[PDB]
């Protein structure tokens, strides 16, 4: 495992925190536990105070009238780590005990408990041009040296670590959101009976929202259009309670219902951030820094307990509207939240915007059942953000290891990943016959996603690709990757090539939720990757093709949310660009 450490500007205090993401179960919130390293030489008789601050920057900038600062401390808690107060009598957690063991005696524990009903870390969208800081709720752990609780805190002996308090989707799915509006008109014979309905209550981020819109216009007046929107409701409850509603994804369907006629249709809307990047005030997940984050997850609350909790509360409702020739609207609540992830979220964009990965030994042979180790050294620190794939001959790679340690669901337990600084190792304990293959190590911290030369270990839901062909020495070719079972918004489509007798090289990658497309240096302008959701199909338009592009192009999928690897691949297409 690994831990986060932030030293002080002077170099005496160092705050160690295991994780930056603390889960808020509706009843109890995860405690913030850590260890401060303190140097007694600097601390003649001073004290080390560590404070958990749940702030809410409700106003952009400050000093508008030369003195006014918009930052309200929702919850501040102080505990004195050094000298240890005997009144503590607290049981050290496993992480705290291990940190104290790894460090000397001068490491001192500190554990806050966040109260149950508190706002979760969210930031409203800055907008195209605001610079400064974002309006939102933030959580901070600040360790400083002082002789008294009120002494002027010095920015030279203080460390500030921004932490995020988050909620994950509940396990048991809720009731099906179905709401119906029966609306009559001057013709009181029989009314419209709109009966919209969603498929479920829990919709993980980037996934579709089916809306079955059953309508029966028993009245004469017609319906010209049906407008389905997914509206994010941000309730800001500081001093003056408010409810902001920012639409996220819309569909202005032109389907019509004739007088005394019925009509059924399943509309599909997906909320993503690419088309809402210009919507100022939008609530987004808490940001540690100025980095891309998703639409704010829905806030879970205990029934009948919202005592005007100060902060920002995010909900979502799908608003279906019939535009009769007097709109007839129905609102369907639904929770839009991340599922609980086994690994902690990466609060930075995982393929962050060239790290060579020297992989050894290139060739190695061994018998059946023995233990074989494969090493890969990165030029720069990848921060436990490598993965290991296995490619059998004439097949596609399969994700074996992600995060340099974690096994992939469905992989034999013999495979195990380990890290030794910048040297990531893969160990096969018992080399059963089903292991002859080329093993590749990919660093997915820095774009360009860099693979290794590959190690040829000898034993001695779907994606379909089309568009190959031995043609066009300098022409164009559109490779189509049809994805079955996957939404282009909850997933990112990466086109990675493999020249004959060569390792995987990353060509293009499109992430629709954030709506950015990245390319390698060699294909920066020649190629264009674009995935359309009409059929959940990705396309790679390949122009100005050269002889060096002859390769078996593969279309892989990476979890758009907390990138774990290229878990799902395709058969691949051989683009033989030759005379």
């Amino acid at each position: 495992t690994r831990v986060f450490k932030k030293a002080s500007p002077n170099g005496k205090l160092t705050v160690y925190l295991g994780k930056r993401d603390f889960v808020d179960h509706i009843d109890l919130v995860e405690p913030v536990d850590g260890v401060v390293l303190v140097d007694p030489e600097y601390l003649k008789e001073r004290r080390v105070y560590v404070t958990l601050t749940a702030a809410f920057r409700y106003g952009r900038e400050d000093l508008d009238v030369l003195g006014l600062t918009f930052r309200k401390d929702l919850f501040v808690a102080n505990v004195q780590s050094f000298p240890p107060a005997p009144e503590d009598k607290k049981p050290l957690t496993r992480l705290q005990e291990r940190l104290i063991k790894k460090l000397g005696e001068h490491a001192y524990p500190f554990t806050f408990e966040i109260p149950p009903n508190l706002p979760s870390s969210v930031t409203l969208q800055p907008g195209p041009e605001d610079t400064g800081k974002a309006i939102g709720v933030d959580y901070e752990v600040k360790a400083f040296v002082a002789e008294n609780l009120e002494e002027k805190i010095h920015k030279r002996n203080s460390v500030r670590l921004v932490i995020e308090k988050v909620q994950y989707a509940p396990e048991r799915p809720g009731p099906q959101p179905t709401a119906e509006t029966t609306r009559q008109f001057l013709m009181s014979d029989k009314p419209l009976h709109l009966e919209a309905s969603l498929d479920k209550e829990i919709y993980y981020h980037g996934e579709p929202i089916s809306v079955n819109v059953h309508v029966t216009n028993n009245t004469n007046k017609t319906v010209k259009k049906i407008k389905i929107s997914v509206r994010q409701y941000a309730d800001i409850v500081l001093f003056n309670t408010a409810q902001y509603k920012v639409p996220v994804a819309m569909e202005e369907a032109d389907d019509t219902v004739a007088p005394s006629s019925t009509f059924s249709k399943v509309y599909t809307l997906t909320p993503f951030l690419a088309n809402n990047r210009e919507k100022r005030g939008l609530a987004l997940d808490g940001k540690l820094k100025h980095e891309d984050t998703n639409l704010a997850s829905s806030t879970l609350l205990r029934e009948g307990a919202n005592r005007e909790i100060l902060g920002i509360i995010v909900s979502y409702k799908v608003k279906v509207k019939l535009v009769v020739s007097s709109d007839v609207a129905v609102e369907l609540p639904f929770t839009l939240m991340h599922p609980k992830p086994k690994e902690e979220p990466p609060h930075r964009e995982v393929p962050e915007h060239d790290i060579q990965m020297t992989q050894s030994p290139s060739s190695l042979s061994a018998s059946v059942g023995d233990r074989v180790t494969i090493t890969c050294r990165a030029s720069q620190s990848v921060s436990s953000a490598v993965a290991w794939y296995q490619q059998k001959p004439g097949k596609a790679p399969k994700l074996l290891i992600y995060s340099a340690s974690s096994l992939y669901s469905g992989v034999p337990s013999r495979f195990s990943g380990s890290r030794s600084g910048t040297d990531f190792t893969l160990t096969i304990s018992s080399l059963q016959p089903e292991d002859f293959a080329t093993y590749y190590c990919q660093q997915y911290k820095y774009v360009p996603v860099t693979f290794g030369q590959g190690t040829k270990v000898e034993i001695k839901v779907q994606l379909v690709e089309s568009g190959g062909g031995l043609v066009q020495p300098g022409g164009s070719l559109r490779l189509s990757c049809a994805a079955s079972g996957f939404n282009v918004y909850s997933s990112s489509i990466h086109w990675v090539r493999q020249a004959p007798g060569k390792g995987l090289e990353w060509v293009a990658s499109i992430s629709s939720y954030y709506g950015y497309t990245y390319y390698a240096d060699s294909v920066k302008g020649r190629f264009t990757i674009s995935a359309d959701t009409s059929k959940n199909t990705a396309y790679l338009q390949m122009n100005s093709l050269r002889a060096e592009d002859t390769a078996v192009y593969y279309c892989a999928r990476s979890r758009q949310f907390w990138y774990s690897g290229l878990d799902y691949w395709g058969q691949g297409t051989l683009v033989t660009v030759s005379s």
Partner: protein, 315 residues
């Protein structure tokens, strides 16, 4: 009904002093705004700029009126010059009050409703507000243009500039037209902007007092200073503008109250002084609005937070 003996000997002098101060302040703030526009990139600054413009174009037309008062209220300039000057003065008075009110409402929206401040597109909202402000100001000043003429020699060969009412108001409609136009001018120039500004600054004061009521010593001193600034702004607006509109309303009231022999004489004696003190804001505006902004002052003239690393916690 005659003017003060010592009036004419001084009204040009106070006007000249107002010229000097208003130039050296309003031109200075406008030049600073033009010099420092991308440096600040602040939405509210537009109003400041607008205000400066008005104030500048408020006082630019001053000398013609000074010389007017010089020769027993005789106007040695063009008739079109008279129309342009009077219309400019009124346009700029209304624009100044409206810009001050707009700045007050901007500060209310950025202090008392700060969650909605980022939601709104202040860059274009302020531009639209200033466009409507200026267009409406010109509209309210269109009458005080059309009814402006020259003459009134009264067999004395003194070509003076004033606001003729005959061209529209009939013999019996003179008083009604005068009172109606005066009422509209005074209300739209003082009341609505004034009440808007007072509510905005009251909400600002309450919010700032509540916000700084935390902490001790330094926070309380800063709160008192901020309240003192809000005071000085509202108090300076009131002191500077109340005399002018008050004498206008007093004229319209005395049109029927009929101040017998002396109060009316006092009104006519003081009115040029009322205009002088009305220029108080046009003079001091850089001190309270530009100088109060640290950007204007700057134009006139072991903290590294390290980085969140990561370490190995072997089991």
């Amino acid at each position: 009904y005659t003017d003060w003996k010592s009036s004419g000997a001084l009204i040009p002098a106070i006007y000249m002093l107002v010229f000097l101060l208003g130039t050296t302040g309003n031109g200075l703030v406008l030049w600073t705004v033009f010099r420092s526009s991308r440096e600040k990139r602040r939405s509210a600054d537009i109003f400041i700029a607008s205000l400066a413009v008005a104030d500048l174009t408020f006082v630019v037309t001053l000398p013609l009126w000074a010389t007017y008062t010089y020769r027993d209220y005789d106007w040695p300039f063009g008739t079109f010059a008279c129309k342009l000057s009077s219309y400019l003065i009124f346009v700029n008075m209304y624009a100044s009050v409206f810009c001050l009110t707009g700045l007050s409402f901007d500060r209310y929206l950025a202090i008392v409703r700060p969650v909605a401040n980022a939601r709104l597109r202040l860059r274009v909202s302020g531009a639209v507000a200033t466009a409507v402000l200026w267009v409406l100001a010109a509209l309210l000043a269109m009458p005080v243009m059309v009814l402006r003429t020259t003459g009134d020699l009264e067999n004395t060969t003194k070509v003076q500039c004033y606001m003729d009412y005959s061209m529209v108001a009939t013999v019996s409609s003179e008083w009604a037209w005068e009172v109606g136009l005066g009422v509209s001018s005074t209300t739209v120039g003082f009341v609505v902007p004034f009440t808007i500004m007072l509510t905005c600054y009251f909400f600002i004061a309450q919010t700032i007092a509540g916000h700084f009521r935390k902490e001790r010593i330094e926070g309380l001193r800063k709160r008192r200073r901020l309240l003192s600034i809000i005071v000085v702004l509202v108090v300076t607006f009131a002191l500077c503008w109340m005399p002018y509109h008050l004498v206008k309303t007093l004229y319209m009231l005395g049109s029927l109250l009929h101040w017998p022999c002396d109060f009316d004489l006092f009104l006519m004696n003081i009115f040029p002084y009322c205009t002088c003190i009305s220029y108080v804001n046009s003079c001091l505006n850089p001190f309270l609005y530009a100088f109060f902004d640290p950007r204007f002052r700057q134009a006139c003239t072991q903290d590294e937070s390290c980085t969140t690393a990561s370490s190995s916690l072997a089991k």
